[PDB]
Amino acid sequence: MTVEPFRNEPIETFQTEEARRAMREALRRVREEFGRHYPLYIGGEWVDTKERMVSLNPSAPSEVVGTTAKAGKAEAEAALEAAWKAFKTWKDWPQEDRSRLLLKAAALMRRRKRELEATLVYEVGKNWVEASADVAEAIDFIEYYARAALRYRYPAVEVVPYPGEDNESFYVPLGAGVVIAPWNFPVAIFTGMIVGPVAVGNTVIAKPAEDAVVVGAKVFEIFHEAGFPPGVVNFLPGVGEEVGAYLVEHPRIRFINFTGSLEVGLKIYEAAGRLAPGQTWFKRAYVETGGKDAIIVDETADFDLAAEGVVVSAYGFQGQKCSAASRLILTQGAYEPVLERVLKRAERLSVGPAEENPDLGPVVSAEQERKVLSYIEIGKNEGQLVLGGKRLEGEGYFIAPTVFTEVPPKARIAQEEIFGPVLSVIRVKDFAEALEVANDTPYGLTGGVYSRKREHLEWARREFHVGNLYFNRKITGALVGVQPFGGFKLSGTNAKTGALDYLRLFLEMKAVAERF
Ligand X SMILES: NC(=O)c1ccc[n+]([C@@H]2O[C@H](COP(=O)([O-])OP(=O)(O)OC[C@H]3O[C@@H](n4cnc5c(N)ncnc54)[C@H](O)[C@@H]3O)[C@@H](O)[C@H]2O)c1
Annotated binding site for L-glutamate: 184, 322-323, 477-478
Give the Cα separation of 460 and 217 in Å (integer): 42
Q: Which of 123, 143, 299, 355 contacts Na ion by CB under 5 A?
A: 123
Work out whether strand 422-428 and strand 325-331 pair parallel, antiparallel, or are unpaired.
Answer: parallel
Nearer residue to ligand X within complex by CB, 286 or 303: 286
Known catalytic membership, residue 96: no
CB count within 10 Å of CB 95 equals 20
Q: CB under 8 A: which stretch of 128-136, 274-282, 385-393, 394-402 binds a second copy?
A: 274-282
* Residues 494-513: x where in contact with a second copy by CB under 8 A, - otherwise, as a string: x-x--xxx--x---xxxxxx
Q: Which of 22, 31, 169, 385 contacts a second copy by CB under 8 A?
A: 169
Work out whether strand 446-450 and strand 468-471 pair parallel, antiparallel, or are unpaired.
Answer: parallel
Give the Cα separation of 264 and 262 in Å (integer): 5
Q: CB under 6 A: which stretch of 70-78, 104-112, 113-121, 282-290 binds ligand X?
A: 282-290
Q: Which of 269, 397, 404, 419 contacts a second copy by CB under 8 A?
A: 269
The active-site residue out of 9, 12, 288, 369 is 288
Q: CB under 5 A: which stretch of 11-19, 116-124, 370-378, 455-463 binds Na ion?
A: 116-124
* Residues 316-345: x where in contact with ligand X by CB under 6 A, - otherwise, as a string: ------x-----------------------
- Window 432-461: residues binding a second copy (CB under 8 A): 442, 457, 461
Contact criterion met (CB below 8 Å) for 259 and 181 = yes
- Tell me if 211 contacts Na ion by CB under 5 A: yes
C-alpha distances (whole Å) from 338 to each of 50, 300, 407 are 56, 11, 16
Residues touching ligand X, count (CB under 6 A): 30
- Tell me if 383 contacts ligand X by CB under 6 A: no
Contact criterion met (CB below 8 Å) for 179 and 194 = yes
Q: CA-based angle 137:130:38, to the nearest 5?
A: 75
Contact criterion met (CB below 8 Å) for 128 and 357 = yes
132: left (phi > 0), else alpha (psi -120 to 50), else beta?
A: alpha
Nearer residue to Na ion within complex by CB, 347 or 367: 367
- Tell me if 32 contacts a second copy by CB under 8 A: no
Say which residues have a Cβ less than 8 Å from residue 238's Cβ, sequence separation at least 6.
53, 70, 71, 72, 75, 76, 207, 244
- Tell me if 355 contacts Na ion by CB under 5 A: no
Q: Return the one option of a second copy, Na ion, ligand X, none that residue 414 interacts with (CB less than 5 to 8 A, by type).
A: none
Nearer residue to a second copy within complex by CB, 54 or 275: 275
Q: Is 78 helix (H, G, I), strand (E, B) or coil?
A: helix
Nearer residue to a second copy within complex by CB, 125 or 175: 175
Stated length of the chain? 516
C-alpha distances (whole Å) from 337 to each of 95, 325, 341, 348, 424 are 55, 18, 6, 17, 16
Which DSSP category does 72 fall into?
-
- Residues interacting with a second copy, by CB under 8 A? 6-8, 92, 157-162, 165, 167-169, 266, 269-275, 280-282, 285, 287, 442, 457, 461-462, 466-473, 478-486, 488-490, 492-494, 496, 499-501, 504, 508-516
- Residues interacting with ligand X, by CB under 6 A? 180-185, 189, 207, 209-210, 240-241, 244-245, 248, 259-261, 264, 267-268, 288-290, 322, 417, 419, 445, 491-492
Active site residue ranges: 288
